[PDB]
């Protein structure tokens, strides 16, 4: 699982099947952030256009974000056409 960052289209995240994910530069491979996974191996994982959202997702439907707590928000944007009341 190798995925370039949205706002940083050269900096990537690399993640194994068990989840040894690392926030890693393209240019300087020394600058690795090797976030370990103290839980079960994965199916898939997704991104953060707001740069601060880990989405690990298996067949369990139980997400968790690991980053520092910059926002109280989840994903990027906040324009829902039936927001909390149809």
């Amino acid at each position: 699982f190798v995925q370039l960052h949205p706002l940083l289209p050269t900096v990537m995240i690399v993640a194994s099947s068990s989840g040894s994910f690392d926030f890693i530069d393209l240019s300087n491979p020394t600058l690795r952030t090797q976030y370990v996974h103290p839980c079960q191996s994965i199916k898939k994982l997704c991104l953060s256009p707001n740069g601060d959202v880990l989405g690990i997702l298996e067949a369990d439907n139980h997400l968790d974000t690991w980053r520092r707590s910059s926002n109280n928000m989840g994903m990027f944007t906040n324009t829902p056409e039936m927001l909390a009341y149809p």
């Binding site: 706002l7 940083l8 289209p9 900096v11 530069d25 240019s27 600058l31």
Partner: protein
Amino acid sequence: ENSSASLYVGDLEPSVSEAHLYDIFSPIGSVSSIRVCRDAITKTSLGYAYVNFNDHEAGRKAIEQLNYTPIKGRLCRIMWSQRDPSLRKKGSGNIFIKNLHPDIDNKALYDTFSVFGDILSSKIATDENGKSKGFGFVHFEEEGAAKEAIDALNGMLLNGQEIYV
């Protein structure tokens, strides 16, 4: 044009990315899109960046929190965006100085010298632990605020060093 941010860093590096760049101004909120568009056979410095935020006011807000503090020798340049009708926008020339005062920075320079003439690019040779190197390039939007600052005081005596045309 350019009512939005369009925050234009020039005088670039070959092989330093936007990584530590985005590391520093992370806690400001509005960081929309940062990109250096490129040529095809070119892993050297070319000279245009785009540290784009949402609006111009986010650029001025990034200035007004903290701006122009030394890290990695680079200081983030401001929106210019000025093409083939600007043959002389920031190319209408500058005072080129021999023997500037050896304590002349850019921030206090424009701070005291916002009175007479608005300095666009104080291309000032400052190196080796706070020392202006005598030669500098104080640069304007015209050559009229230049003559205003010269005819006011083309430099003055604080430790005696008048500056040059």
